[PDB]
Amino acid sequence: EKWTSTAIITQPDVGQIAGYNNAMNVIYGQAAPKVSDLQETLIGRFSSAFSALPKLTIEPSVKNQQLPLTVSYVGQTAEGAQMKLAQYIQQVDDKVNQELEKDLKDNIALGRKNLQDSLRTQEVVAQEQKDLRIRQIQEALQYANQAQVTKPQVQQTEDVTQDTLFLLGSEALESMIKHEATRPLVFSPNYYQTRQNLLDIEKLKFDDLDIHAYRYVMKPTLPIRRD
Amino acid sequence: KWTSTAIITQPDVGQIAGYNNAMNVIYGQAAPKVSDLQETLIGRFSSAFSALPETLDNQEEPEKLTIEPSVKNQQLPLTVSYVGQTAEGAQMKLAQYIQQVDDKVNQELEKDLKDNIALGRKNLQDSLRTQEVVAQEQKDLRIRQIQEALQYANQAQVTKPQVQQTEDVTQDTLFLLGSEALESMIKHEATRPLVFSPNYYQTRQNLLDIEKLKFDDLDIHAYRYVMKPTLPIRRDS
Amino acid sequence: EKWTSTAIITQPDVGQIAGYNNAMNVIYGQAAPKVSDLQETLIGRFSSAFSALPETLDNQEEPEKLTIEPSVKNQQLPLTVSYVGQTAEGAQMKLAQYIQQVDDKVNQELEKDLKDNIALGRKNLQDSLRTQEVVAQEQKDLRIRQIQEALQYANQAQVTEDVTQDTLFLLGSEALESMIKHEATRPLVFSPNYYQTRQNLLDIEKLKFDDLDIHAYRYVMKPTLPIRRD
Ligand SMILES: [Cl-]
Ligand SMILES: [Mg+2]
């Protein structure tokens, strides 16, 4: 005795995908895939996983149309065939959800690393620049004292450079040395952006986003008669 | 006995203009091309329709309803067919099943639009927030630099500006503005405007425009008739 | 009795399409569809219209047999159209007439499509001008606030080309007060892109359907004259 249960599935909705898509935009920004590309990626991952299970069937519902897909199972009873089809759909859904959990955490790790490497480099540079400028201020103070330049001798600010700092006068130069510790670090234009981007990536968690690789057009049927 | 046929294809750019405008407003450059939306909409209609051939067959008295491409190896247009008992009945039931699907798809589209609006808003609010944090951190750095320069201006005992010509001031040349102007910059720290990229203003306005979107305003069509359900002049075979 | 006339049609060639592709590039710029995508769009619209005729010609008092099929086993294009006539001259004549009839309906559909695309391209360029206008206003609004802040610093000492938020006060309170009157009446400053968008909108207004010689198909094989009846 043979009973066939049928279901029609298609790509998941933007609502079902919103969390993964948001996570992808937080990690990749403009380089993140379009919502429609993610939908196609997921139903493809689901279809390929179903096809490699390896009696069930997976075929396009309309000839020459990629979507939707008709899934079928031949059981011993109408209730069993329906049950087993829904179970196999859930089983595939979970395998795809697991391979999505891995890929996202790998992308988060790649994201975190590149951003921490970028911040570290910019921090080292900003400190080395502060350190050099301090040595330059220390050197300029010796020149200002020799030359008896106590008050600033600046007419145009452009005149003041890393090599003409003594023009600021020994009084202000001493103050700059005395107050070195509280002199702020100056970072490359994107530092703060990079640091905020990293904070937002750390806020991501797969458990928050309940992602689905498919959507039901028609749930598994209860066959009225046998084949 | 009697077959009623209809031919349906993707909606026209005119029929889709509203949904495409809503999509453009939500995603900007990331929005799908007009031709991709047309395929998505006929895709959503045909997918919903494909449940009916299966459901109508799994009845006590099975009904025959078909959805196939009109020309072999061509995705569009699609031929929808219904086998009825009478000519008037076959036509009536085909049009009813097309209307039934049309209603379900309109509801799916209403939910889709609000889901996309929610996603678009999240992305734009995340963008504005980030940009605001950056602009504040940049302002905060400048105030710290002014605070440091005020200590130098006081030690050098320079109260009035010391400079005639000045393009820009640096950490080392700020004290030349004098302790009087530097104190004023600190006392008014709060009212110093934040400086944002031109993208910021685009993003903020784009968020305002998303809030203006309403489903009832957009007359959306998921298909276009090539041929409405026929009235068969004679029975089959 | 029965005579079969056959024709093979396919997508329009790159020369037949040059004008429609030139109009689409005026409307969408770089966002305009690839020439091969336009070809498929035009043949798609022709074959869709044609696909009604087999059904409608059969559902007549006196049924007529017209068929559309792909000419090549696993190819979308070209398409083979067949008509069964009563006479040899008639089958061929009626096939060519039905191809012309579809060609006329599709030309009307294309005229409506061009105006729908012109409306969409208009909307996108007018939306672009409006955001550039919002940005230019927000920039003007920020500049007035920066000068207002600098005026507070100037009032704490000063009275009398490239300036910053920190060096504006050096222009003196007198000059700064004047700017709050001047810059507030000073017209908006837009990117050269703004005037270019206005130019692209002017070029869309110059588009006319009668100017572009539009073809939705191309003959591979014109309707045949059958040698002997069915
Ligand atoms: Cl002084
Ligand atoms: Mg910013």
Author numbering:
A (entry chain C): 4 to 57, 68 to 240
B (entry chain B): 5 to 241
C (entry chain A): 4 to 163, 171 to 240
Sentences from the paper on this structure:
The Oag polymer chains are neither all of the same length nor of random length, and fall in a defined range termed the modal distribution. This distribution is regulated by two Wzz proteins in S. flexneri: WzzBSF, which confers an average modal chain-length of 10–17 Oag repeat units (short (S)-type), and WzzpHS2, which confers a very long (VL-type) modal chain-length of > 90 Oag repeat units. The S. flexneri Wzz proteins are members of the PCP1a family and are located in the inner membrane.
Site-directed and in-frame insertion mutagenesis studies of WzzBSF revealed that mutations in the TM or periplasmic regions can influence the Oag modal chain-lengths. The residue 107 is located in a helix in the base-domain of the protein, close to the trans-membrane regions. A107P confers a shortened Oag chain-length to bacteria and leads to a loss of resistance to colicin E2. Binding analyses reveal positive cooperativity for the interaction of very-short (VS) core-plus-Oag polysaccharide (COPS) with the periplasmic domain of WzzBSF, and a decreased COPS-binding affinity for the A107P mutant. The crystal structure of the mutant protein shows only subtle structural differences near the mutation, compared to the wild-type protein. Our observations suggest that a single amino-acid substitution on the inner surface of the periplasmic domain can lead to significant effects on the regulation on Oag modal chain-length, and implicates the LPS-binding affinity as an important parameter in the mechanism of this process.
